[PDB]
Point group: D3
Chain length 259, copies 6
């Protein structure tokens, strides 16, 4: 069923729960192959009669450190690759928003940028109190164009959304729950157990009621689709600008950027 | 003025406050007459020159347990009745959203389903810290189509909205106020006193200023009217499916549903 | 010479392209006719000024603004041509700020009321003193809350909290404002300006197009409620020639109002 | 039921068609009672199970010449009256957009201002080739705030809408059909027969299919409700300005207005 | 394309894919074709050998609409009805979300379920003597399978309501006059014209074309919730009495007697 | 007043009509100065108390041939220039949509791309029967991002919008009026006389009524602001692609493009 997504791990759980695991170098960074697979996996899951609920997590004590340096290098260096990556970033968000089956995220450690999209667009997000949530874009040197403009104002309100998206100050899981960015917060060691119970309970519930409830609520995000697409275009116009070269170098060299 | 709404209690307060009380068996369950009366009372109130403010509450330590089993039976069992009940559900929400006079809710004990609609669409909602707020639909086996999709994302943010609407985990009044679902939280024995003070202050205030302020704010909900109507359609298509028959049987038999 | 057309405002260069914009007038920085016009019209000039990267806006001393001056309110009520002029200024204060690409950081101490509050809360990052006093006062004065709240409060604090404060006119401390999402962050009064200064300087040293394009994209959410804002403003201004505002004002200028 | 609307003539037709006739002095001028009755009749029709379709027309060879001197002068000269009339103007539009039963208009001769609203918001509008369709507002000296901003762009497109609304050039029934403002155009003596056949065919069709089709389509107008309401406020702020006094004078005295 | 057995795929020149609806009985859409039409579009969008789709019926018919087999299942079986509904939803949404351009070549009848594809095509080439009929209200269900996402933005609301409510046949010539289709030619020039247009797109600047149509399609996406409301209402109609009579009347080639 | 706009001619007409004339080489091509001047002139006009209405036209037998080859070369060749030009393109559309004073366009000869923006976003557009209206972007090799996505669907409906925007087939002024793209069409020799009459009539009319009518109608375009900005970003991502290089070379060498 999932042969077309070789960078992703697909592990059956109980009662139609599918465990989807992000397992890659650099605390589950999202590189070119994973970026494509994450974009295009959701429609396949929605048509799979043996899956009722997706439970998504990173391998180990990390959800994702964000786009890999290889992903960013490809985007900066090649026009065709940049547009392909853009199409994938667009479709990750829209395919998730258009997925009728529910998604529960189990967020431990870092959850950044391209991986954070999945963590936060999950229907129910379970965050470690000590998770480290960072959108990351403005610190890298590009606009926050990969999901935040479709949802953050309707998660945390505009004042908190602007504070964290503009500054890229780290948000703990506990603080994320406090302001509404995530559904619930528990101790790190209880994140997977808690997310698993929630996923199993949805999987044994009334399926169309559940799916139709989340589909209806998702119209709120769909109404900000054009807003999201504008943000994405502006992010991608940034990848040929000078700031991102410094932002990326600063990341690679473990130092502060000097824009 | 209101002999045409026999299931509701109408009690004048001071300064143009109208007390509207839901008083029925099963902790103020909503049967066929009450469901009809709650839909259609609002336009009559808005045209009544002796009413300035509505203060809505249940009798005793309960707002409402929601639709009665017999109301649900009609929704499942009769084509014309189902459409009638759907139109009433539609118009409860839209007549409230289109009401220029302010409504204050005094929420004690359970507030569920069809009765929760009024509690939460009230302009100012006063919740007991120990109220029990439950949308209830997905546990019954139908989509949450009777109000939540017009408002919950804009009350609590999407992550909290999805958590409670999909799982139907009970929300206390205290937690509801923390996440923004209700306006204010006080101890159970202070709910009606607090609500009465707030209602009387509105009734003695500048009427057009108050009404025009809430009307303008209500544009936000009106923009999600189509979203709401889609949710309502999916809920009511659910009354034609197998899950609700199990969910209703389970509620009657005081046992877990086995979907 | 750049800002000579705005005589009521103080323009003081900070570090790294930060412009300090200071509201300094008698009566805890009350806003008179010149200042109301200058606050409306300054923003496009700032956006085109290549030497400004970030605006840090504050009142002089322990106040952001106490409200509109006697003279401003008197022209609003007493003269048709002047009233429409003031309405245009009120409209464009909100819309020019929502259309501003450069970031604005507000440092809110003491009272924040009227056009000053508009600026304080539409700032991209709002830093509130724990003991700031935030008041939307309109309905208490006898007019609709038409000067900004309808473009933003539901998407800051959710509808239940927005209706509560806008309909009751209860004072919101800076501490409570931060608890409910109205402002970005809260610190002790003596830390407000240092905190706001750090935040402003950090934005000014960051990746400029990334920051500006992020906030621009987020501001589409407020732009979508433009018509709702303009409805609220029209209703406020229809109120200015009604009997209620005479009593609400007469009362303020002289106890409970007797509407 | 219908006794509460004394200015309106209600005449049953065949198959559940209700004829609603506007019959008053000055080619069916709308006076204060008629303006109120037209606003408030629609919800009563929707609840009457003996009515399936409304066929609305003027008496004789005129739909309506628009507001009577009394109605216009009240709006200029009295605060309370102006607000009442504004409420009615608002609710004529919104109650029609929210009506599930179909309305067919039979438009002969003049259709102006306040009675034009019903003619054009009818689901099916049958225009005499020689009807004279005049929004009229800018020529009276006030904004076109009584319906056109909820619908004209989605009838004729924006360039045609602005042309006729800004200039107030008369639109013939024939030209109205050419550009899409009305559904069909026939000779004057065929208008009532054609409208009657269409109304009777709707009345004999599949009722919920028809009602739900038009309800769904009406969501498009509802999404421009806030745009409509801001137009309405601007119109009503104009009734306090100097131009309308000259506009009313010029209308009554068959001279070109000299603004 | 092996997964879409009911569709004919004929490669053309320059990356034009001809997609032909070919079934016995004027290309009625049966169960298999209804599923295939829903799900084919995302596969086309990912196929690097296809640049443009030219969609047509076999012979002098685009499609007579849903087959009797298809309507019977929809009426007769809950699980089937929900499946068919999902397909009806996804036909529209997958077409609206397709980046590659679609040219329709419309000859003879274009009805209901096959009319969806004809009119949601980016460029629609209609025979002057095509017969365009939405068909739903005459069958006895709401027009819920596409028209509410687009007709008001094609022909304006007055023409949209006229044809959707009455189901009067619209010729291709009149359809072009009112803006429902892009262009009109004689029957024998339809396929040549459509082919020339498709090849010109296929030889054009690809991303420019795709991004132009994608951007324009945001207008339809904004009415997604309106479309989904219409679809639910249609599907609630399929278990009502009217459709049984409409279907019977079509079989027997007599007028329906609904009321 | 207008010292800041050197590429534009500003000539007083009668009664507060300002004649704004585009006069430059190559049939009024838009170079870098004129591109910035056209973007930024509108807010200055709105504040100029001596101007009531703008009448915009080209010098001689052309409105504008659109962007000059130097303007397009800078967009392709320089990152900082490209971003500047994008800002100007954005602000031309938004500043025009946000202008309260009415604009009448007198369209003779070609009106293409960047010059076509002003011609079609004018409130009243008067087209020569033999004007040549060409959006032109897809033929150049970039998306139609400079205005069409904010308005064409609401002018001509989606079928006609897609036809002309995807193909870049020329549209005559006569055909443009038939489909609703422009307000009115007269023969070439009558364009300036007709536009002058209309502009003078507006300038002698009820000023606030006129301005508030067009402002309210412009909310329809504002609601598609995000859609417009998306299209603009996609156009500008096009300028670093291979197609536009070929499209520009094709134009220069007066030949067909070979993408
Ligand atoms: Cl990233």
């Amino acid at each position: 069923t999932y042969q077309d997504f070789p960078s992703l791990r697909f592990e059956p759980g109980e009662h139609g729960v599918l465990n989807l695991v992000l397992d890659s170098p650099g605390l589950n960074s999202v590189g070119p192959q994973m970026h494509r697979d994450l974009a295009d996996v959701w429609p396949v899951i929605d048509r799979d009669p043996d899956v009722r609920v997706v439970l998504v997590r990173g391998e180990g004590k990390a959800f994702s450190s964000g786009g890999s340096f290889e992903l960013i290098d490809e985007t900066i260096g090649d026009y065709e690759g940049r547009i392909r990556i853009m199409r994938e970033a667009r479709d990750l968000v829209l395919n998730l928003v258009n997925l009728d089956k529910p998604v529960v995220s189990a967020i431990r450690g870092p959850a950044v940028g391209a991986g954070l999209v999945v963590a936060l667009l999950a229907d129910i997000s379970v965050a470690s109190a000590t998770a480290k949530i960072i959108d990351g874009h403005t610190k890298l040197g590009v606009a926050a164009g990969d999901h935040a403009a479709i949802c953050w104002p309707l998660l945390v309100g505009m004042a908190k959304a602007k504070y964290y998206l503009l500054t890229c100050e780290t948000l703990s899981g506990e603080e994320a729950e406090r302001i509404g960015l995530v559904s619930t917060c528990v101790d790190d060691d209880e994140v997977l157990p808690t997310a698993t119970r929630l996923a199993e309970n949805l999987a044994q519930g009334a399926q169309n009621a559940i799916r139709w409830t989340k589909r209806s609520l998702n119209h709120w995000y769909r109404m900000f689709g054009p807003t999201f697409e504008t943000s994405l275009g502006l992010e991608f116009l940034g990848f040929t600008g000078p700031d991102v070269q410094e932002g990326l170098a600063a990341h690679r060299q473990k130092r502060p950027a000097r824009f």
